[PDB]
Symmetry: C2
């Protein structure tokens, strides 16, 4: 699997055991002014996230 | 918890113990033209979905959104 990542220079290749891509979004103190914080990666399973975090999971290449 | 729902006949109120709202999307035969199919609801945990189907989970009231079509 390949997934899009948080930084443009990162390898998109997932570790063997990670077939899900994800996009995690949340707000910080600057959320309304600068935008939502984001993290993109691979995972073995769709991440459980804290309250107030939003998580989008998919399992095709670069689907995030 | 309250969440957006797919059909007009569904109450927004979640069952007790279902604190997650979800947007589940996929493509049918018209996807490239008419965009994704969508289901919106409540759940106790974020639904696990098969390859080809995408799932977005959040845990605030009515947080489950769907962008139909082009920005307007």
């Amino acid at each position: 699997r390949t997934c899009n990542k948080t930084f443009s220079d990162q390898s998109k290749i997932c570790p063997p055991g990670e077939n899900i891509c994800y996009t995690k979004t949340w707000c910080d103190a600057f959320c309304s002014q600068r935008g939502k914080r984001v993290e993109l990666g691979c995972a073995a399973t769709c991440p459980k996230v804290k309250a107030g975090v939003e998580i989008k999971c998919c399992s095709t290449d670069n689907c995030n």
